[PDB]
Amino acid sequence: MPLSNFEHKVITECVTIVLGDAIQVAKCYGESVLVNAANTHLKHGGGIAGAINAASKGAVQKESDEYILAKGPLQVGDSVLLQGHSLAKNILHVVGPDARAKQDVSLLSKCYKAMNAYPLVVTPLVSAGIFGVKPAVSFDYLIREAKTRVLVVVNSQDVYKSLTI
Numbered sequence: 001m002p003l004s005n006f007e008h009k010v011i012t013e014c015v016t017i018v019l020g021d022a023i024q025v026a027k028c029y030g031e032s033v034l035v036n037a038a039n040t041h042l043k044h045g046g047g048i049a050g051a052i053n054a055a056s057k058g059a060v061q062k063e064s065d066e067y068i069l070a071k072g073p074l075q076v077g078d079s080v081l082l083q084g085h086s087l088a089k090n091i092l093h094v095v096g097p098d099a100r101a102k103q104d105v106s107l108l109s110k111c112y113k114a115m116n117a118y119p120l121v122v123t124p125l126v127s128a129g130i131f132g133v134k135p136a137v138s139f140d141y142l143i144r145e146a147k148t149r150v151l152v153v154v155n156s157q158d159v160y161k162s163l164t165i
C-alpha cells in the first residue's frame with residue numbers, strides 16, 4: 001500500500017508516475033534507490049538536491065564533499081551511488097545536462113540508463129528544473145531507458161496532469 005498514499009498512474013510494467021515529494025515516496029520503500037538530480041561538483045544548494053540534503057540533516061553534502069575531494073568532479077551524464085542516510089537504501093547522484101549551458105540534452109539517456117542497476121528506483125525528472133529541460137522531454141528520455149521498476153515522482157500537479165492526460 002505505499003502508493004495508496006499518493007495519486008499515481010502506471011504507464012508500463014516498469015514506469016509509474018507519482019504526484020508528490022520523491023523523498024516521501026522513497027521513505028515508503030526501504031529497498032528503494034533514490035535519484036538525486038545533481039551537478040558536477042555535488043553542490044546541493046537547492047532543488048531536489050537541497051531537499052534531499054536537508055532531509056539527511058546535511059550528511060549528504062558532507063559525504064559528497066569527501067567524494068569530490070578524493071575523486072575530482074564528475075562529468076555531465078555521470079552518476080555515483082552514495083549512502084542513503086536512512087532516506088533510502090542508497091542515493092544515486094546523477095549529473096543531468098544543463099540546457100542553460102547548451103550541454104547535450106541527449107546525455108539524459110546516460111543518466112537514466114544508470115538507474116537500471118537497481119531493482120527499485122525512485123526518481124525526479126532529471127534536468128527538468130533549473131537545468132531548463134522540459135519535464136515532458138526528461139520523461140521521454142526516462143521511459144526510453146527504464147528496464148527496472150521506476151517510480152517517477154513529480155511535485156507539480158500541472159506536470160503530473162500533463163504527463164498523465
Ligand SMILES: NC(=O)c1ccc[n+]([C@@H]2O[C@H](COP(=O)([O-])OP(=O)(O)OC[C@H]3O[C@@H](n4cnc5c(N)ncnc54)[C@H](O)[C@@H]3O)[C@@H](O)[C@H]2O)c1
Binds near residue numbers: 021022131
Ligand atoms: N537555489 C539553488 O542553488 C538551486 C536551485 C535548484 C537546483 N539547484 C541545483 O541544480 C542541479 C539540478 O538541476 P535539475 O534541473 O537537474 O534538478 P531540479 O532539482 O532543479 O529539478 C528537477 C525536477 O524535479 C522537481 N522537484 C523538485 N523537488 C522535488 C521533489 N522533492 N520531489 C519530486 N520532484 C521535485 C523539480 O521541480 C524539477 O521539475 C542541482 O545541483 C541543484 O543543487 C540549485
